[PDB]
Design a protein around this ligand. Structure first.
Ligand code: HEM
Ligand code: HEM
Ligand code: HEM
Ligand code: HEM
Lengths: 141, 146, 141, 146
């Protein structure tokens, strides 16, 4: 789990993203598809091109699913139940992919918020994503 | 690793703009802060109680320079990474016995430091060119394991 | 995160071990040092021989640390706070060692309780040990 | 892999006593129940809703026999595992693109089935020998990645 200081360091880092959630979430998604092309096989119904309003439209829902996860962090299994029903139960996503997106999500935030990306916040954000990943990769019916 | 000519040129130019003093130490330091357990291989370094202390550690800053230098040597030999890091593989695997997942983690933390330093300049395909390099350096550093 | 079904499965399977806690925990500990000789480097102040009342005495504390963890499951970071201060804070253990011991713990019970080791219970036990491994490797100060 | 003769004899004696029908199907069956994300690769198999349905699936049972056979061929060639699984590597790596951790997971789930089947007879030194076998089979099956 996460330290109380981690719960704060995510809230104040993600609370510096702004309405830039989709832009960042789109960058994260684009960085993943480009760097690790196997993650593309999860989206055959997707236009995986540059600028794609589908990918830029996913990164919104994705970066907004991550927002309610930052809200009620100490209630992650209950709050992400529909997302877990999708990822764990329906999609059956390999957790390595979750590590790939989590990494790209950190490269994005480091590219865009260099001041909010302190060695301590990197750690907190990585712990947070690891936890979101755990809740989304597990079947807790 | 085998990469396309455009990507080979894009990494050389990005690396050609690297801070050869404070990047490796930021790469090595962040490893110790994000993945604490790695501090156990660096007891001969002293004081790593706070991130500020881990980064502001002259030993970490010094060693990290020799790590970035190993990476700079790897970008020079992308045809034979396996032999450039063979003796380095012998060191980490047969004598230091470091779990190879931590080689995936250091390389992925170097990608986070270049993202931190270059910003917009560290574009999605530049990263994609670097992810190929760090994984290859991690496949070559964990060679005496397969 | 564990399914409510998993929490019961672990209680009924680990609740079939009996006073053989120290025996199993010893075997798991032994199987680990034997199969993965690197886990030995964490115990230099140990007699890592067969039969050793130290290793057989460690497997007691270990399998007993696992017993209170199964008790108050839905409180595992609060419960194992001293163990976390040890494994995470003091000893600084690479979590791979935790995947390894967890593997050995599954082999031990597989060998000793073959009936209680259904594919459903294996999954439940692998999720529990993974959850315990997380807690012990994480600094939640 | 290079293991000691006593362990090499111990694995062959243990494997000789194995049930060459319902062990492989139990190994491939527990892979899908414990690691659900792997069911995604076996869509051409049908009905994997309950563990009782995953194991009690003729497709899983039959395919597992060929998986166990790959391992049997692997125990015969412990000098050259990398060449026995060279075409199997090509299949899982270059054509199926299965993440290599899953190879460690099936190998370790075989060890969990053997412990189940043999009980007291799968002693700590027999596991240590088998761990060397499944690691080398996982190293050979993930060869077209390094
Ligand atoms: C940081 C973790 C992630 C979050 C927060 C997340 C969130 C979401 C959300 C919100 C949806 C769309 C459903 C909706 O409208 O709410 C979704 C769909 C999906 N996710 Fe994720 N996801 C994450 C990571 C991943 C990863 C790493 C993969 C696989 C590489 C993945 C694959 C998919 C796929 C294939 C869909 C299809 C559904 C659709 O077409 O919208 N997700 N995800
Ligand atoms: C893949 C990136 C890595 C590279 C290129 C690398 C490179 C090096 C180099 C060049 C040395 C210096 C050897 C000398 O002094 O002659 C070294 C030493 C060392 N490396 Fe690495 N290394 C890597 C990853 C790791 C990791 C992941 C760990 C541990 C978590 C590690 C732990 C050490 C230690 C403990 C030393 C000796 C310093 C000491 O404690 O006295 N290395 N490494
Ligand atoms: C199921 C996993 C684990 C549990 C429940 C656990 C539990 C324990 C307990 C209860 C102690 C002794 C302190 C006490 O309570 O009196 C301990 C100590 C220790 N553990 Fe673990 N442990 C686990 C996994 C590991 C692993 C995988 C390693 C590393 C290979 C590890 C390394 C140690 C070491 C080196 C000590 C030193 C302290 C002593 O000598 O007792 N533990 N562990
Ligand atoms: C390291 C252990 C493994 C061995 C020795 C192995 C061996 C094999 C063999 C011999 C085949 C059949 C080739 C034929 O049909 O002629 C096969 C097929 C296949 N393997 Fe593996 N495999 C292993 C692990 C995996 C893993 C970890 C996965 C994925 C979770 C996987 C997924 C598949 C799939 C999808 C097929 C084709 C079956 C279909 O039609 O869906 N294998 N494997």
């Amino acid at each position: 789990v996460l330290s109380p200081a981690d719960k704060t360091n995510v809230k104040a880092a993600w609370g510096k993203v702004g309405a830039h959630a989709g832009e960042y979430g789109a960058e994260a998604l684009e960085r993943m598809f480009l760097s690790f092309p196997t993650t593309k096989t999860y989206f055959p119904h997707f236009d995986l091109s540059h600028g794609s309003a589908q990918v830029k439209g996913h990164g919104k829902k994705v970066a907004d699913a991550l927002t309610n996860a930052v809200a009620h962090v100490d209630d992650m299994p209950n709050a992400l139940s529909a997302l877990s029903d999708l990822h764990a139960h329906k999609l059956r996503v390999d957790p390595v992919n979750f590590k790939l997106l989590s990494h790209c999500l950190l490269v994005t935030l480091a590219a865009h918020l260099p001041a909010e990306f302190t060695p301590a916040v990197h750690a907190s954000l990585d712990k947070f994503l690891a936890s979101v990943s755990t809740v989304l990769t597990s079947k807790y019916r | 690793v085998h990469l396309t000519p455009v990507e080979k040129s894009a990494v050389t130019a990005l690396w050609g703009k690297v801070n050869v003093d404070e990047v490796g130490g930021e790469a090595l330091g962040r490893l110790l802060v994000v993945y604490p357990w790695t501090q156990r291989f660096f007891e001969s370094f002293g004081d790593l109680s706070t991130p500020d202390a881990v980064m502001g550690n002259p030993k970490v800053k010094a060693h990290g320079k020799k790590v970035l230098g190993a990476f700079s040597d790897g970008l020079a030999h992308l045809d034979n990474l396996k032999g450039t890091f063979a003796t380095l593989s012998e060191l980490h695997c047969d004598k230091l016995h470091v779990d190879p997942e931590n080689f995936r983690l250091l390389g992925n933390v170097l990608v986070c430091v270049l993202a931190h330093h270059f910003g917009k300049e560290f574009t999605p395909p530049v990263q994609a060119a670097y992810q190929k390099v760090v994984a290859g350096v991690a496949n070559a550093l964990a060679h005496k394991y397969h």
